[PDB]
Amino acid sequence: SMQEEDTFRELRIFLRNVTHRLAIDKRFRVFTKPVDPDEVPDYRTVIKEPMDLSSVISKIDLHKYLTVKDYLRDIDLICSNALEYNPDRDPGDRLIRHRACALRDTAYAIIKEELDEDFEQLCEEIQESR
């Protein structure tokens, strides 16, 4: 129905706003663009599904996300990719891990405050009917 397409349009507006707020935070610069194959040719041999915040905006506009749960699966993949690629005791690895944990925690905290639980349940029930 038109009402259901208006629901998904409201979801996309919300997801674009959350994603911009994460992308402008100086802590999260390293997560804003894909890893450059040149600079790190090893990355795509270890990390089997790369993800970054520029790819997330593109996915919103391609209508890939019909619930906030499917958006958070991609924010979780950004964070788990950085934990697995940078696992060592050295300062550079510990700094990226702390930033990746902060990106995940910040996204979940914005959604807990600003997303109504009944709006999410409506999107889930429309998705399950299709």
Residues engaged in binding ligand RK7 (CB under 6 A): 16-17, 19-20, 57
Q: Compare residues 9 and 20 and give the one whose CB is closer to ligand RK7.
A: 20
Cβ of residue 37: shortest distance to ligand RK7, in angstroms? 24
Q: Compare residues 19 and 81 and give the one whose CB is closer to ligand RK7.
A: 19
Cβ of residue 60: shortest distance to ligand RK7, in angstroms? 8
3-class SS at 39?
coil
Q: Using CB positions, name the residue nearest to ligand RK7.
A: 20
3-class SS at 128?
helix
Q: Which structure tokens are listed for 106?
A: 């910040």
Sequence-distant (≥ 6) Cβ neighbours of residue 80 within 8 angstroms:
none
Q: Compare residues 20 and 73 and give the one whose CB is closer to ligand RK7.
A: 20
Distance CA 78, CA 76 (A): 6
